[PDB]
Write a protein that binds this ligand. Sequence first.
Ligand SMILES: C[S@@+](CC[C@H](N)C(=O)[O-])C[C@H]1O[C@@H](n2cnc3c(N)ncnc32)[C@H](O)[C@@H]1O
Length: 281
Amino acid sequence: MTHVPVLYQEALDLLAVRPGGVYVDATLGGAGHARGILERGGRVIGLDQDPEAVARAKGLHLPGLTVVQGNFRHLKRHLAALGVERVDGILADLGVSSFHLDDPSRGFSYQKEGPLDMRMGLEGPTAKEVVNRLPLEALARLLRELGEEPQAYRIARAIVAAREKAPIETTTQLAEIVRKAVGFRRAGHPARKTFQALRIYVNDELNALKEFLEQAAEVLAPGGRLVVIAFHSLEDRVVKRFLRESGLKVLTKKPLVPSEKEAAQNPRARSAKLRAAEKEA
Ligand SMILES: C[S@@+](CC[C@H](N)C(=O)[O-])C[C@H]1O[C@@H](n2cnc3c(N)ncnc32)[C@H](O)[C@@H]1O
């Protein structure tokens, strides 16, 4: 009915906020976690590429919060433009915003009709252009690599068959095309993996993440904490590998996961994996 930010206390405790400190909330969203950092006395530089989240966040007029519209893969550059080279802590709660999920017009849901857009921000071609133009081979690779889709070729072929008939324009048309090609699927609706892959591709999520992570490690002041909450297999693996290969002190050998109570209350929270590391010296 409101939804407490995922792993709120765990994330904040790991950030070890101290009054006067400066923290980066790299995925501001509705500012749920940011509010917690402000409450603990830290200042927050919050980034978000979704124009609707940026507008909303600013409309909250929270003292101590600086909102930056932009992609976290430009973190170092944007902090430098605010006159900041080091920060005390960094948080990233990955995924789409409330608007992305509750506003069918953004085209993120295979269940709610809307145009195939899927861009969290305003950068690059839409999912519509990707599904109507990528050659079969490229399409299948995208589904396989970014969606871990076992029936990548079969789905890609169905998408090509349909688009050669008429442009694929809506989430529900794409979802039905994938559903007809796959049929029953135990794990989740047959269109889920395809939608996830297209979302990752359209937003170049994995590379943006890898770039943000290395810049985050660099700008952390001594003893500062990098805290990331991952929600799907591919991004959690990127976070896990980065942290262990980074040289940072890994604080969470195993990811922190929400209690069944939190999982019960907030479904989105069920696949959450929180990992953190510390900058030393
Ligand atoms: C799960 S929501 C954040 C919810 C937030 N923790 C709260 O408590 O309200 C993630 C936000 O990250 C943003 N986001 C995702 N990838 C991004 C990127 N590469 N650069 C900037 N913002 C990004 C989205 O637009 C979305 O608003």
